[PDB]
C-alpha cells in the first residue's frame with residue numbers, strides 16, 4: 340500500500356515516498372536537525388524524461404570544447420568535444436580507449452561551466468527547480484533557504500545547479516576507486532539522479548554490481564530494493580556526520596604517513612579531495628575511531644539531501660546523470676560562518 344515514508348540504514352536514514360507531498364517538512368525537519376542525510380524517491384516521475392537523456396545532450400551541445408577526467412588515475416584529457424563523452428555513455432564500442440586498448444571510465448569536468456547552467460539550459464533549469472522536493476528549503480527564494488538573506492560574514496553558495504556526469508566503474512580493481520573522492524561542502528545540497536545508463540552491448544552486469552553493494556556495507560532492506568521492484572541502481576554513496584570530520588582527518592593523516600606521504604601535522608586530507616575510503620579504510624574508521632557512516636544506494640529518481648559539513652564520497656555502479664542544487668538551511672547555518 341502507499342505510505343508517507345520508510346527507513347533505510349537499519350532506521351538511521353529517512354526515505355520519503357511522495358516528492359511533492361505538502362506535509363514532508365513535518366517528518367524531514369527532526370531528522371535534518373539531528374545532522375542526518377535524507378533520501379526522497381520518485382523525482383524522475385515528476386520530470387520531462389526527454390530533457391534528461393544522453394543523446395539529447397550530445398545533439399544539442401556536442402560541438403562544445405571540454406576537458407574529461409580518467410576516474411582510474413585522475414589524469415586530465417584536455418580539449419576534446421562534449422560529443423566524445425556523451426556518445427560513449429551507454430554504448431561501450433563508442434568509448435575513448437586508453438593506450439592499453441581498454442575502454443576508459445570518464446567524467447565530464449566543469450560542464451556546463453561555472454554558473455552557466457541557467458543561460459545554456461533554461462528549459463532543464465525550470466523542469467528541475469519546479470520539481471525539487473522540500474521546496475521551502477531547496478528553491479532559490481524558499482522561506483527556509485537563507486542563501487539570499489545573509490551578509491558576507493557567511494560563505495554563500497555559487498548559483499546552481501551543478502551536474503555530475505560520469506561512466507560506471509566496471510572491474511574488481513575499480514571497486515576501490517571513487518567517481519568523486521571524499522570531500523565536504525560548507526552549504527547544504529540536494530543531489531537528484533535524473534538518468535541511469537546500463538550497457539547491454541557489454542554491461543548490465545549485476546554480478547560485480549552485487550559484490551560492490553555487499554562489500555559497500557549496504558543494509559538488508561537496500562539489498563531487497565535490487566532483487567524485488569527492479570529499479571535501476573546508479574551510485575553507491577558513503578556519507579559521515581559533520582561532527583566526525585576531524586576523526587576522519589586523524590585516520591587519513593596516519594594512513595598518509597604509513598604510505599610514506601610527507602605532510603605537515605595540520606594538513607587537511609578531506610580538503611585535498613585525494614582519498615576514497617575502500618572496505619579496509621571504512622572498517623578501520625569504525626574499529627579504531629568509533630565512526631559509523633551511512634551507506635546509500637541512489638536509484639533513478641532518488642534525491643539525496645547532504646548536510647553542510649558532512650564528508651561524502653560517490654562510486655558510480657552504472658553511467659549516471661546527476662543534478663544538484665545548494666541551499667542554506669537555518670538548522671546548519673553555523674557551518675558557513677567566517678568567525679570563531
Ligand SMILES: O=C(Nc1cccnc1)c1ccc(Cl)cc1Cl
Nearest residue numbers: 434435436437438439440441442
Ligand atoms: O590511440 C590510442 N588508443 C586506441 C586506439 C584504438 C583503439 N583502442 C585504443 C591512444 C589513446 C591514448 C593515448 Cl595517451 C595514446 C594512444 Cl596511441
Ligand SMILES: [Cl-]
Nearest residue numbers: 460461462463
Ligand atoms: Cl534546456
Ligand SMILES: [Cl-]
Nearest residue numbers: 364473474475
Ligand atoms: Cl518544504
Ligand SMILES: [Cl-]
Nearest residue numbers: 518519520612
Ligand atoms: Cl574527485
Ligand SMILES: [Cl-]
Nearest residue numbers: 374581670671
Ligand atoms: Cl550540524
Ligand SMILES: [Mn+2]
Nearest residue numbers: 522523524651
Ligand atoms: Mn559533494
